[PDB]
Point group: D2
Chain length 489, copies 4
C-alpha cells in the first residue's frame, strides 16, 4: 500500500506479468504492507530468457573496455544513490539504516567496481606442442545465467552475482527472494541507466517453488547462481543438473566455529564473538554461531560477552542510533524462538535474551532479543542446526586439538575463525579448519579480492576474487594443426 504495484523488469523496462497473481512484501519493523508485487508466469520466464539471449549478444559484442566503462558508470550511480537504496533496503529487510548505508550498497558496488576493472584482464592460454602444432584456449561467456537471491542482503547479493556475470560478458536473469524483492528492481534500472543493453539484466519476481524452479529447469539457461538454505540448495542444484546439466554456484548456510585460544585477549575475542553473532540481528550466513572457549577463560569471557550484549541498541531500524533491528519476517522470528525453546528444553544455560521483545511498538515488529546460551553440548539442536537468528552457543573445551576436531565435526563448512596472539596457533589451526572462509583475529570482513564460499554442504563454487570471474566463463581449447595429418585408414 505504501508503494505502487511492482512489475517485472525485462528488456530495459518494466513490463506487466501474465500470471494475474501478486504477492505482498511486508516491513518487518511495523507490519505495514510495502507493495503488491507481481508473480512471474511460466511464459514470463520465456520472455525474459529470449530478452536475455538477445541482450547478451549485443553486450558480448562490445569491447572489454566498453563493458568496463559501462559497469563503472553503474558503480558511480550506486555511489550517488547509496542512501536512497539503503533506506529502501531497511524498509524491506528490517536491517538498521546504520548497516544498509555503510555496508549493503557500499560492499555491493565495491565488487562491481572490482570486476569492472578486470574485464580486459580475462585471458586464455597458449601452449606449443611442436613446430607444426599449437593450442590456445578461449574464455567465452556462458551466455544466459540466472541468479537467485536470499533475503538477508538482497541488493548486495544481486550485485555480487551480477557483477562477475556481466563482466564476463553474460546476461543474468535475477530472481530476488519473495521476502525482499524491492532493491533488485532498482538495480535493474541503474544498469539500464548506466548503458547496459536491454535484456542483459532482467528481474523476475515470484516464488522459488515456481519462478525459481522454472529458471532452474530452463534448457537455454547455462548456469544457476544460488544463495540460500542448504536444504533448498540441494533441490535447486539437483533440478539444475537433471534438467540440462547447468553449471552451478551454491552459497549456502553454515554453523561456523569461532575458536578462542587460551592466550587470547578476551576483549577482542568478545567483540569478535558479538560481531560474529548479532550483526544484522544474527542473519548473516558466515555467523560464528558456535563459540569455543577454553575452560580457563569461560567465566571472564561470558562476562565480557554479557557486558557487550547489554549495550546493544535494539530499536527502530530507521533510527540512525539503532544497531540491532527486528528479524526479516514474523514466520522467521517464530522459527528462531522455536530454536530458543529447544535450547531451554535441552538444559543449555541461558545467559541473556531468549525472548521476543513485545514492549510498546516493538510488539508491532518481529524483534527477538540478542540471545546467548552457554554450557552447550555438541548434540544440542541449537549447536547442530543453523538458526539464522541472534543465537550464540558458547561451548567449553580443554584440549586445543579437541576444539578443532569439534569445530570440524559438522556437515557445514562455510566459515571459521580463531582468536590468538600466537603465530603458530593462528596458522596451524586455520590450516586444519575445514571451511572456505577463514578469519584470524577478526570476523565478517569480505573484500572484493577475497574468494568466498563453503566447504562440504555449505557450498559449491565461490564468489568474489579473480577465480569467480573465471568461473563465469567456459574454456574452449583450440588446436591448430599446421603440418600433416596422419590417418591409420
Amino acid at each position: 500500500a505504501r508503494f505502487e504495484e511492482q512489475k517485472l523488469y525485462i528488456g530495459g523496462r518494466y513490463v506487466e506479468a501474465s500470471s494475474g497473481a501478486t504477492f505482498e512484501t511486508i516491513n518487518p519493523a511495523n507490519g505495514e504492507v510495502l507493495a503488491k508485487v507481481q508473480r512471474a508466469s511460466r511464459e514470463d520466464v520465456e520472455r525474459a530468457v529470449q530478452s536475455a539471449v538477445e541482450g547478451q549478444k549485443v553486450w558480448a559484442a562490445m569491447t572489454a573496455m566498453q563493458r568496463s566503462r559501462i559497469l563503472r558508470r553503474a558503480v558511480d550511480i550506486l555511489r550517488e544513490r547509496n542512501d536512497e537504496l539503503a533506506a529502501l533496503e531497511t524498509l524491506d529487510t528490517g536491517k538498521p539504516l546504520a548497516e544498509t548505508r555503510s555496508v549493503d550498497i557500499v560492499t555491493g558496488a565495491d565488487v562491481l567496481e572490482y570486476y569492472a576493472g578486470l574485464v580486459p584482464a580475462i585471458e586464455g592460454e597458449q601452449i606449443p606442442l611442436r613446430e607444426t602444432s599449437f593450442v590456445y584456449t578461449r574464455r567465452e561467456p556462458l551466455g544466459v545465467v540466472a541468479g537467485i537471491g536470499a533475503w538477508n542482503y538482497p541488493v548486495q547479493i544481486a550485485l555480487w552475482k551480477s557483477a562477475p556475470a556481466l563482466a564476463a560478458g553474460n546476461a543474468m536473469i535475477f530472481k530476488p527472494s519473495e521476502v525482499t524483492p524491492l532493491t533488485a528492481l532498482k538495480l535493474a534500472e541503474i544498469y539500464t541507466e548506466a548503458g547496459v543493453p536491454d535484456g542483459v539484466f532482467n528481474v523476475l519476481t515470484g516464488s522459488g517453488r515456481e519462478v525459481g524452479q522454472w529458471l532452474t529447469e530452463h534448457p537455454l539457461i547455462e548456469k544457476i547462481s544460488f544463495t540460500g538454505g542448504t536444504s533448498t540448495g540441494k533441490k535447486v542444484m539437483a533440478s539444475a543438473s537433471s534438467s540440462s546439466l547447468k553449471e552451478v554456484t551454491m552459497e549456502l548456510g553454515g554453523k561456523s566455529p569461532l575458536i578462542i585460544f587460551p592466550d587470547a585477549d578476551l576483549d577482542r575475542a568478545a567483540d569478535i564473538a558479538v560481531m560474529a553473532n548479532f550483526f544484522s540481528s544474527g542473519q548473516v550466513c558466515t555467523n560464528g554461531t558456535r563459540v569455543f572457549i577454553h575452560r580457563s577463560q569461560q567465566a571472564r569471557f561470558e562476562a565480557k560477552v554479557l557486558e557487550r550484549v547489554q549495550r546493544i541498541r535494539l530499536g527502530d531500524p530507521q533510527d540512525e542510533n539503532t544497531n540491532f533491528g527486528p528479524l526479516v519476517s514474523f514466520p522467521h522470528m517464530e522459527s528462531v524462538l522455536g530454536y530458543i525453546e529447544s535450547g531451554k528444553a535441552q538444559k543449555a544455560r541461558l545467559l541473556c535474551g531468549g525472548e521476543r521483545v513485545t514492549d510498546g511498538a516493538f510488539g508491532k515488529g518481529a524483534y527477538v532479543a540478542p540471545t546467548v546460551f552457554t554450557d552447550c553440548r555438541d548434540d544440542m539442536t541449537i549447536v547442530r542446526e543453523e538458526i539464522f537468528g541472534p543465537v550464540m552457543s558458547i561451548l567449553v573445551y580443554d584440549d586445543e586439538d579437541e576444539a578443532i576436531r569439534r569445530a570440524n565435526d559438522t556437515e557445514y563448512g562455510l566459515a571459521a575463525g580463531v582468536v590468538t596472539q600466537d603465530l603458530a596457533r593462528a596458522h596451524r589451526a586455520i590450516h586444519r579448519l575445514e571451511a572456505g572462509i577463514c578469519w584470524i583475529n577478526t570476523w565478517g570482513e569480505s573484500p572484493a579480492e577475497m574468494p568466498v564460499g563453503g566447504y562440504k554442504q555449505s557450498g559449491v563454487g565461490r564468489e568474489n576474487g579473480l577465480t569467480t570471474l573465471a568461473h563465469y566463463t567456459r574454456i574452449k581449447s583450440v588446436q591448430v594443426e599446421l603440418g600433416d595429418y596422419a590417418s591409420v585408414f
Copy 2:
C-alpha cells in the same frame, strides 16, 4: 572362465566382496567369458570409503615432491607394462591391438606423467588489503573423490581421472564400467607397487544403478568425476547434488560437427572425416559424426571417403593388421543397427556398410561395418542423436554461416572441427562453434596440456591441462588481521 574370479581392490590389496553376487565380462570378438567379477555391496562401499579417508591422510601428509616421485614410478611401470595392459584392454573392449598398445595406455600414462611433474606447482594467492591486514588462499585437497568410468577407453579414463585427483592429494574410489572392469584393477596394483599408500586408489566393481549410485550418494565423498552418456550423466549429477552437494565433473556424449570449407584439400578432409568416425569402431565421444560438406565438393568428397572406407581392415582385434574391430558389446551392436535402420527408413542415402558382418568367425563377434550415410537432414534421427558406433552422416550446405549455425543447432557441444587452408575461415569459424574441444585441420589429438570437456549438455568441468589439477582442490581464503578489530556493539 578364461581368468580367475576378479575381486574388489581396497587398501592396497584384493578383498572379497560381501554381496554374494557376481557378473561376467565378455570378449566381444568371440563371445568368450573372460571372468566372473564380484559385485560390491553397500557395505563394501563403506569399507572403501573408510580405507580412502585414511589413505588420503597419509598421502596428503607427504611432501609435494614425494607424491611426484611416486606418481613418476607408476608412470614408469605403466611404460614397461604397456603391451600386457593393451592386450588385456583389447580382450575386454574388442579394440584393435594396434590402438590399445599405441594410444590407450600411452596417452593414459602421458597425463599421469604430466600431473606428476606439476604437484609442486600447486599454489594459492596472496593479497594485501592494507598495512594491517592481508589475505592468502590455500588450495587444499577435496579429500575422498570417486571416479566412474565408461567402457570405450577403460584404463585411459581411470588414468585421466585418478592422475589429477592423486596429484592434488586426494584419494579416489574408482568404479569401472560393468562392460570393462579388468584394466582398472591392474591400475590399482601398479599404484600400490609404485608406493601409493593403501586406500588412495580403490576399485569397486559392480553396476551403476547400485555401486555407482551408492558412491554418488555417500555423504563422505566430496566429488564425483563421471564419463558416460548424457542421460546417465544428468541422473548421476542430480543424485550427487541432492545427496550431499558434491562437486562434479561430467564428460558426456556429443554429436560433434566437422565442417569442410569449400577451399579444403579433400584428401585431408576425407582422412580427417574417416579418422573422426571410424577410430575405435566409431566408439569415441569426440567423434565428428555430422560432417558438413559444401555442395560444390560433395561428389568428390563422397568418393574420397569411399576410397578410404573400402580399405579399412576390419578383423580380429588381436591381429596387429586389424585397424577396425567389433563393437564393445552385442547389445550395443543391436542399438547401432537400430540407428542404421532408422537412417534407411528415413531415406538417407546409404553410401557404404549399413550391415552386421556375419561371415565366418565375424559371426562370433559383434562386428558392424563402417557405415556412411549422405544427403542427410537435420531432423533425421541419425543426425540428431548420438549413435556411438561407426556411422557418419554427411550433410550438404551452401552458405558457410548456415553450416556454422546448423553445427551449433544441438543440445550437445563436446567437440568441433574445421578443415580449411584459409587463416580467416579457420579462426573465425572455430570462435563461433559452441564446443569445448576444437580442432583445425586435424582431429582426435588430445594432449595432456589441453583441457578438454563439453559445452552445454556435453559436460561440466574439464579434464587434462592446468585447470583440471586446480579443480581437484578447493580454495580456502585466510584473512589475517594484524591491527585492531572494531565492533559496532
Copy 3:
C-alpha cells in the same frame, strides 16, 4: 617564444631550476621557438628524488582501489583535454593533428585506463611446504623509478611508462626528450589535478648527457625505463647497472622485416607496407622498413605502392587534411637525407621521393618526401641501419625460407610481420621470426593488453599487458616457520 619559459615540475607544482641554464624547443614545421625550457641541475635531481621518496610513501599507503579511482580520474581528464593535448603535441613534434588527435593521447590514456583497473589484481603466491611451514610472496613497489622519454611519441611514452609504474604503487621521475619536453609537463599537471599525491609524478627537463645521466646514476632510484636509440640505450643501461644495480626497461630501435608471401592480397600488402613506413613520417620504432616481396610480385607490388605514395597528403601538420608532416627536427632531417644519399650511391633503385621538400612554406620546415627504394641488397647501408625516416627498402626474394633467414639476419628484433592468406604459413613463419612484436595481415596496432618490446639489441623488458605491471613490483618471499628450528651447532 610562443609560450612562456617552462619550469621543472616537482612536488605537485612548477619550481625554478637551480642551474641557471636553459634550452629551447622549436616547431619543426616553421623553425619558430615554442619555448625556453629550464635545465635541471644535480641539486634539482636530488630535490626530485626526495620529493618522489615522500610521495611514494603516501601513494603506497593508500588502498588499491583508491589508487585505481585516482588514475581513472586522470583518464577522464585526458579524454576531455585530448584535443588541447594533441594540438600541443603537434606543435612540439611536427606530427599531423590528424594523428595526434586520434592516436597519441587516446592510446596513452587507453593504457592508463587499463592499468587503473588492474591495481586490485596485483597478487603474490602462497606455497605450502609442510604442515609446520609455508611461504607467501609479496609484490611490493620498487619505490622511486625514472622514465626517460623519446621525441616521436612524447606524451604516449610518458603515459605507457608512468601508468604501470604508478598503478604498482611507485613514484616516477620522468625526463622527456630535450626535443619534445612540452606535453610531459602537461601530464604532470593532470596527474596532480586528478588527486595523485605530490612527488609521485615529477618531471625534470634537460639533456641526456646531464639530467638523464644523473637519473641513471642516482643511488635512490630503483629502475630506469628508457625508450630511444639502441646506442644510447646501451650507455643508459650500463650507467644504471654499474652505478647501483638498477632494474631496467629498454624499448630501442629496429629494422623490422615485413614479409609479403606469394599468396598475399597485394592491395592489403601495399596498404600494410605504406602504413608500416610512412605513418608519423616514418618516425615509428616498429616500422617495417625492410619489405620482402617475391620476385613474381615485384613489378605489380611496386606499382601498388606508388599509387598509394602519390596520394599521400604531405603538408602543414595543423591542417586536418594533412596525413604526412615534416620530421621532428632539422638535424634528424639531415641524417635521413644522408641515408637517402647513401642509397643512391650504393645503386638502389629510387622508386619515389629521395629529396627534401622545399617549395614555398615547406622550406621553412623539415620536410622529407616519402621515399621508396627497390632492388635493394642485404649489404646496403639503408638496409642494415635504422633510418627513422620515411624510407622503405624493398627486397626481392625467391623462396620463403630464404626470406625468413634474411629477415632474421640482423642485430635488431623489435617487430616483424607477414602477409598471407594461408593458415599454416601465417603461424609457421611468425614462429620463426626473431622479434618481440609480430603482426599477421596487419601492422602497427598495439593494444593495451599486448606486451610489446624487442628481442636482441632492440630491447630488454616489455611495455603494456599484465607482465609489465608485474615488472614494476619486486618479489619478496616470506617463509613462515610454525614448528621447530634445527641447528647443526
Copy 4:
C-alpha cells in the same frame, strides 16, 4: 697435483684449450694442489658459443616432455653420485663433508627436479581484441645464455642456474669461479650422460677478467646469470648491458639483519643466529651478520650464543664429525682477519674467536675461529661491510621501530629475518623489511618453489620458483588480423 689437468667441456666432451695457459685449484684445508686447469682463450669462447647455438636448436626441437625426461635422468644420476660429488666439492671448497653430503648436491638436484616437472607448464597468453582479431603470446627460449658461478656453493649454483635455463629450452655456457672449477666439469659429464644434447651445457674455465669478461661481451649470448660480489656484479652487469643489451640475473652479497624481538624464544634465537652466521664457516650470502637484540635480552642472549659457539666442531672437513671447516682460500682468510682486526680497533667487544686457528694441522689450512663481536655500532666497518666470513655482529636496540629502520639502513637487501611468537609483529615487521628473502622464526631454508634474490644492490632478478622459469624465456606477442586492414594513405 692430486688430479690430472682439467680441460674445457664443449660439445659433449672434454677438449683442449687454445690459450696455452693454466692455473691451479688448491685445497684450502692443507694447501695441496688439487689440479692444473686450462684457461679458455677468446677462440675457445667462440667455439663454445657455436657449439651452444647448435645444441640449443636440437634441444629446443624436442618436445617439453622429452626435455623433462632427460632432466629427470640427470636428477637420478646426481642422486646416485651424491657422495662422490660431495667429496669432490669438499676438496675444492673446504666445506665440511657433513654439509656437502646433505646440502649442496641434494638441493641442487632438488631444483633441477622441480624444473624438470615444470617444462610442459610453460605457457603463453591468448587475448581476444574483437571478433576479427586476437593476440596470443609465445614464451620462446632466449637461445644461448651464460652462467657465471661463485666459489661458496659451486655445484649448487651451477645447478640453480642451469636447471631453469635448460628447462626453458636454452643452452648454457657456464664459467665456474677460478677458485672452485672442479664440480662444474662433473655436472657437464652428467648432463651429457643423461641425454642432454652436445653443446647445451658447456663449461669454460678461466678468470673473470678474461673468460668471464668475454662471455659478458659476446654478441650471441642473450643473458648472463651471475652470482658473486656486489662490486663485481656491477662490472659484469655493465659489460653485459653495454656490449649487446643482454638480459641479466644478479645474485649478489648482503649484510642481512636478524631481528630478535623481546618476546622471542632466546634458545631458538641463539640457534638461529649461530646457523645464520657459522654455517659453511660463514660463507653464505644470505647470512644474518647483523644481529639485533633488545637491551633487556643482551646478557642472556650473548651467553646462549657463547654456549653454542663453544661446541662448534672446527676441524678437518673430511672428518664426518666436523661441522665447521676452513675458509675457501688463504687470501679470503686474510681479508676476514683484516675485518676482525678492524673490529678490535674500532672498539667492538670481542665475545669469542677473533683469531686464525694454527695449532698442528690447522696451520696448513685457512682456519678462522667462529667470531662474535658485541656492543657494535652502526658506523663500524664490520657492521657496514660484507665480511663473508664467520663474524657475527651483535647490535643492541631499545625499541622495535628503531631496530627496523636500522635493519633497513643499508645499500644491501638480500635477506632479513625476525624471531618472535607474536602473530602481528611477525608479519608487520617482515612487511617493513627491505629484503627479497625473509624468514620468520627460522633461517637459511631455500625451497625450490621459493623465488630468491636481492632488493637494492643485493640483486637483480630471482632464482628458483615459477617466476625464474619464466625469466628464462622471452615473450613474443602475435596479433592475428582476421578482418580488414585500414590504411590512412
